[PDB]
Write a protein that binds this ligand. Structure first.
Ligand SMILES: [Zn+2]
Length: 288
């Protein structure tokens, strides 16, 4: 692993506008010949690329980000194209010192690794159990716990970065608890439609609270909630490439503005425990 305060050059996939956190999984599917070639060499060259926390995506302005290390690589060939699907985990946060694009179009970023309250954890843990009671997979260390919380939380991207700037685990834990106290989400374009609340979130899996899935190119972050409001389902369930196995999906849509706020999931077998659960896209929701 890269040393603290070091300065190295790490590739930037120009498509990603997600804000990754150390320990946050990123699913990627690459169709472009260049991006594919970059990952292949990178697979031999430490499998480490850069995920920037863009402030203004239009200008592509990010002051910091986190490193992502590839752990899965599978190659396919569809419609005459060579495609690559890779999975990578956040490893180390960094601060952007420089970023210039080489002649080949390969965007590289030179960055500096940023160096690495028990009752505050537990009190924060009690606040999470109030919204949903579950069985632990939650981490023991305070460092890891601050990151998992930052990833699995309905956070605005503005505040998502603000917790990456914090270099103290105890400070991350303290700032994160203040937000959980600060209640419900809403439709972005509307800003009036109230969709769900913190009491509805739950975890189908260990990383259940929030996780990411690829567009069968686009990468969505989907919040799992038990019930929802003010959203119309459209059509009938389909079992095609259900992001959650054994469930069928139907597109949800805002009643007022018709923005696609997510999907509604339904068990193909009565045996499954969360019979009714909703997947909601983070990009379509703004916290109140
Ligand atoms: Zn709306």
């Amino acid at each position: 692993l890269h040393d603290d305060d070091s300065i190295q050059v790490i590739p930037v996939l120009p498509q990603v506008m997600m804000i990754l956190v150390p320990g946050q999984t990123l699913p990627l599917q690459l169709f472009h010949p260049q991006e594919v070639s970059m990952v292949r060499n990178l697979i031999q060259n430490d499998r480490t690329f850069a995920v920037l926390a863009y402030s203004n995506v239009q200008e592509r302005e990010a002051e910091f980000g986190t490193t992502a290390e590839i752990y899965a690589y599978r190659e396919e060939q569809d419609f005459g194209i060579e495609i690559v699907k890779v999975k990578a985990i956040g490893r180390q946060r960094f601060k952007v010192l420089e970023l210039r694009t080489q002649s080949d179009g390969i965007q590289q970023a030179k960055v500096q690794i940023l160096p690495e309250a028990e009752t505050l954890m537990d009190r924060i843990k009690k606040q999470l159990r109030e919204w949903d009671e579950n069985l632990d997979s939650l981490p023991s260390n305070p460092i890891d716990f601050s990151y998992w919380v930052a990833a699995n939380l309905p956070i605005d991207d503005s505040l998502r970065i603000q917790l990456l700037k914090i270099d103290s685990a105890i400070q991350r834990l303290r700032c994160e608890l203040d937000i959980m106290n600060k209640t419900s989400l809403c439709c972005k374009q509307c800003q009036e439609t109230e969709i769900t609340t913190k009491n509805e979130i739950f975890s189908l899996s260990r990383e259940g609270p929030m996780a990411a899935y690829v567009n069968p190119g686009y990468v969505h972050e989907i919040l799992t909630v038990y019930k929802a409001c003010n959203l119309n389902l459209i059509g009938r369930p389909s079992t095609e490439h259900s992001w959650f196995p054994g469930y069928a999906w139907t597109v949800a849509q805002c009643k007022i503005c018709a923005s696609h706020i997510g999907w509604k999931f339904t068990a193909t077998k009565k045996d499954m425990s969360p019979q009714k659960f909703w997947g909601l896209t983070r990009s379509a929701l703004i916290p109140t």
